[PDB]
Design a protein around this nucleic acid. Sequence first.
RNA 1: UCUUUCUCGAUUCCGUGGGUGGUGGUGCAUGGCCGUUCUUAGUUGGUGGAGCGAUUUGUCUGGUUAAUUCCGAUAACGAACGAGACUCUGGCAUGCUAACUAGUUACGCGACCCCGGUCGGCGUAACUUCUUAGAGGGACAAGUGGCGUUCAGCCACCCGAGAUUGAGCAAUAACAGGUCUGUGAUGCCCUUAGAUGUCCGGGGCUGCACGCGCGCUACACUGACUGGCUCAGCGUGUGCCUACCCUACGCCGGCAGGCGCGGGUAACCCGUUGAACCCCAUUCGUGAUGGGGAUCGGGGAUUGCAAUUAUUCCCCAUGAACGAGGAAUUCCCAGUAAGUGCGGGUCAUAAGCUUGCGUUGAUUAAGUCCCUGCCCUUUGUACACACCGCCCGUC
RNA 2: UCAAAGUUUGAGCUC
Lengths: 105, 96, 57, 141, 75, 62, 187, 55
Amino acid sequence: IEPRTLQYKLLEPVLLLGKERFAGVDIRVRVKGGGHVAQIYAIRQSISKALVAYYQKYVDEASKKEIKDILIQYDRTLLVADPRRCESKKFGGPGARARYQKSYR
Amino acid sequence: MLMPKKNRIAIYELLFKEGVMVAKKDVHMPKHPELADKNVPNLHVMKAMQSLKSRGYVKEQFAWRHFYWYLTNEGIQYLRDYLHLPPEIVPATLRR
Amino acid sequence: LRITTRKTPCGEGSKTWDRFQMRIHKRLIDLHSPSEIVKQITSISIEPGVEVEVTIA
Amino acid sequence: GVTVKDVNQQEFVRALAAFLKKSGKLKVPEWVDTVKLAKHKELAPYDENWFYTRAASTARHLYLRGGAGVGSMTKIYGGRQRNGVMPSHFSRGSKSVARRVLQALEGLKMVEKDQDGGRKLTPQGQRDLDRIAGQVAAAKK
Amino acid sequence: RDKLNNLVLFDKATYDKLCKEVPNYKLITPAVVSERLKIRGSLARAALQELLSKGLIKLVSKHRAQVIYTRNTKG
Amino acid sequence: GRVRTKTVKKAARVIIEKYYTRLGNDFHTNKRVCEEIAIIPSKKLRNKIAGYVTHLMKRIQR
Amino acid sequence: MAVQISKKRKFVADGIFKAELNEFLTRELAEDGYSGVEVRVTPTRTEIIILATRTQNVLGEKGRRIRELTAVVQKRFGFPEGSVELYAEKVATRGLCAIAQAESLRYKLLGGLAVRRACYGVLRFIMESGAKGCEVVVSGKLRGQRAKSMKFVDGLMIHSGDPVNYYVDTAVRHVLLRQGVLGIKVK
Amino acid sequence: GHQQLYWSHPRKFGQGSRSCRVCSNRHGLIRKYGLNMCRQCFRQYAKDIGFIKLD
RNA sequence: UCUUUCUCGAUUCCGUGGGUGGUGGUGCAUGGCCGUUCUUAGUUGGUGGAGCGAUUUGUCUGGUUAAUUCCGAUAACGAACGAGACUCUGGCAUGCUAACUAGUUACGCGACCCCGGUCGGCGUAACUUCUUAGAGGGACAAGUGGCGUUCAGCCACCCGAGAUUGAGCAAUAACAGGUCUGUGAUGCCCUUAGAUGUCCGGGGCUGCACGCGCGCUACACUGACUGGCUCAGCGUGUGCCUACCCUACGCCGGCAGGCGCGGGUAACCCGUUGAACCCCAUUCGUGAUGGGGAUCGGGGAUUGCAAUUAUUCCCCAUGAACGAGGAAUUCCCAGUAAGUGCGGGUCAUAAGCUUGCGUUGAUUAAGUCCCUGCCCUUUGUACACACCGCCCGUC
RNA sequence: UCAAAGUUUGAGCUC
Ligand SMILES: [Mg+2]
Ligand SMILES: [Mg+2]
Ligand SMILES: [Mg+2]
Ligand SMILES: [Mg+2]
Ligand SMILES: [Mg+2]
Ligand SMILES: [Mg+2]
Ligand SMILES: [Mg+2]
Ligand SMILES: [Mg+2]
Ligand SMILES: [Mg+2]
Ligand SMILES: [Mg+2]
Ligand SMILES: [Mg+2]
Ligand SMILES: [Mg+2]
Ligand SMILES: [Mg+2]
Ligand SMILES: [Zn+2]
């Protein structure tokens, strides 16, 4: 699965929850927006949500809480969203933050 | 300013038939835009109109690149005196 | 529609720039009806900013 | 079975170049030796039978998305004309080499000019794609 | 200030030295052999690809930028 | 920092001082009170008014 | 239509028309008490409202200047004959249209009424009308070579933001005095 | 005659060829969509034209 | 201009009155326009009080607040601007209003692979979940602890999809830094036929022993050389005059560029906005190296009326220093700094200007005012065109 | 529990 350099990033939550939860599912993931890594770190969180929603939605909720809590006890970024987005270059300078270069001499 | 006598009389007639006139201030014009049926290059209309102004016949205003001239009653009466027309007929702005 | 101008008269003040947007909005309505009734609805209820273009077929 | 998405693409191009040579019925151009891959490129392609490698890639892009004309294959196949001291820009591939790769695959029945324009992959082409997919799949397996 | 004047081809005695010693290093990269015996990294890559052909070294991770091979697992 | 302006504060003292009984501690309910009785054009103004009006009601109830 | 012009191009042509008209009537009713324009671009007909407070006085002799203005608009812009028609509407808040009241005052200043008392008088007249405030900056060089500034300010006044766009009426004006040229910044 | 002299220099392209219909200047002509105006008149007339400071 | 002679028919040329023209000089005569101070938290009337007066108090020791934000102390009270507020954007709305120029969920077929799977190959209707955008609605310190008049609220933690989304505008007052070099923007002074006008062609701005500032490229292998693979966001498209449209589909040249039919004036055609990076195997090999691409010979194209100061693009070649930055100095706290490409204005060649667009993605600090600046209080002053100050003696 | 820190066109500030 290219890019193959970012695969273990993809399995971290899969390894965290284990194959027993995901075993009953097969999931294709459609991706759009952002760039390649941004989208990769996106589909990471996406499938873990879809599975928690699967047990919370179509079967009993104790499965949703146990999965979700194991997730909370491992790592909070899985739940707290990255709001981070790329800042635009601004007029009045050569770079992003700088306002134009003051030039002695 | 070299007019053809034909233009002197037809241009005075133009001033009569529409009491008022507008024109772009643009020396570098082959043809006049609003009045493109005749060639009458904008420089011709411009220089004649500034000559009329000089003798009191048009009211001046200038915007962007464009003069704006209001023809006065002295102008209406002078045009009909030159062309020897009756007092019955009028421009479209006078006619109602 | 996006435009970026300088405030300065000369060269010499600061070099300042605008970030001018201009949005242009399109709605469109399709009816299945004779022509005269639609002419009746269309004549009434329009205001200056709006521009209506009705294709007949 | 398997497809291009299933394959690791590097050994894909080497297997397909061998596969197309085995067929030996592409009608390779006369100038394959002389030509350089883009006016913006410096050396000729590393693969010796490179014209076959781009015939593979162009066909496989037409599988990925059909209707890919010459200009279309050059946009997808565009990149940095690293201008050294001047700033970088987008640079199309070479026409003669791209147009002849597409005309080569149009010749040997891999690609087909569909009605209402653009290429679609022909019955023989989709056959060859999944067979060489199985061959390369067996290699990586 | 410093310069690397590396040899393009192995002598026969050096060939015996390779056949003896190189499979003993735990790190076998073309660059490793290049720094120790003052030889080029590219022919070094071809040499380690040759210990592969003759069947002397196991690959850990080769990659366009950087390759790594070793003597096969020791135990 | 979420600090109350003088237009925020004076409004909260006027709200608690005139209708201490209607008001209460919880924001979202006494919000319904504030939007009904007082016509606040902006929702941000409404909600801020209500949140300082609430905490102040707790001050007086204390 | 057969000419089949683009959306993007048509709308910019509209913008240039608008800008030229605003400039043109500012130039026209200086003497007549110009108070803005309103180009209600309706179907077929394009209503073109002169704005003035005393519209019958600014109108003059029997509707003369208005028939020539309607004809002028048609002449330069190329309207169908009688497709565009001008209407000199009464100004809302008749004091505050600055360029009407401020320019008339500019020409009052040019006529020789003192600048302080005249601006005070207009601000007072328009205050009796019920204005919120002003901050009138009249730059130049007066009673001397130095660049002295007059500044007529009163009432509650705000400056920044968007709200100002439809809160503040603004003007920039040159005036050709006997002594020189005077700047006008009307906020 | 004068008719073959008066305006004989070729004006086919560039901001020198076309010019602002306001300024007659060759500085910043907005040529997109045929606006054809200099950065100064544009800054002057943007509100009338409909441009707006959204961001 | 000369010998020379023909048209229209008083329009005009030439004088004189008088205007008028002038990219004349002067933005240090002017209007107007910028930056920085200043992205900080500050500023100003009224009435009353204190002072012969200039002025002060209001505008505070303290708490508090991101905030001259608030509270409370209290000879003051009520106000104003600015901050905030506002407008727009992001986000919560499977809710209202809704759509063959948007699709949708139910199935079936067809070619093949081992019933199904795939397909921008085809058919079955409603609807708006997705899509598009109007109206409404939506989160607030909502929970707690210390601390505090148990006030304002802080800090920390909990609680949560949001507990600062991000802009635009931006106070009073400067500099005697700049703009008459955008215009019939323009004051004053001067000029106008034996002209300082103007028109035609051409030039300098690109003229080069020398130097600087903004910029561009580097010193390589965490990388370059050579193939293949992959998600975008900014965008545009045939014009009043106005010469150049976006472009689908098959052929020709390495490149500039050449021949058939189409869609589109545009959610219909461009266009699934066919980006790079990423990802894989080679090749390079630590080299002034394929690092670096300045300079230029000879030639082929296009852009243009016209380029010598190479129009641009193209083809082959010579190939400076530079082996990671000394005293110096630019840039940065979160998707930021930094890598990397992509687009636009202008736009004939088409981004070398300039201004955006995506894409990958840290360190450090939660602190302080030492440096550098800044803000307040007190203080001294012989300065007040204000330390870029004033000011002293010999010769 | 104190080594030092100088100057600034003649070419026009101002009720
Ligand atoms: Mg690509
Ligand atoms: Mg001055
Ligand atoms: Mg305000
Ligand atoms: Mg001066
Ligand atoms: Mg604010
Ligand atoms: Mg001027
Ligand atoms: Mg010439
Ligand atoms: Mg290395
Ligand atoms: Mg080189
Ligand atoms: Mg060379
Ligand atoms: Mg003393
Ligand atoms: Mg000392
Ligand atoms: Mg001096
Ligand atoms: Zn301008």
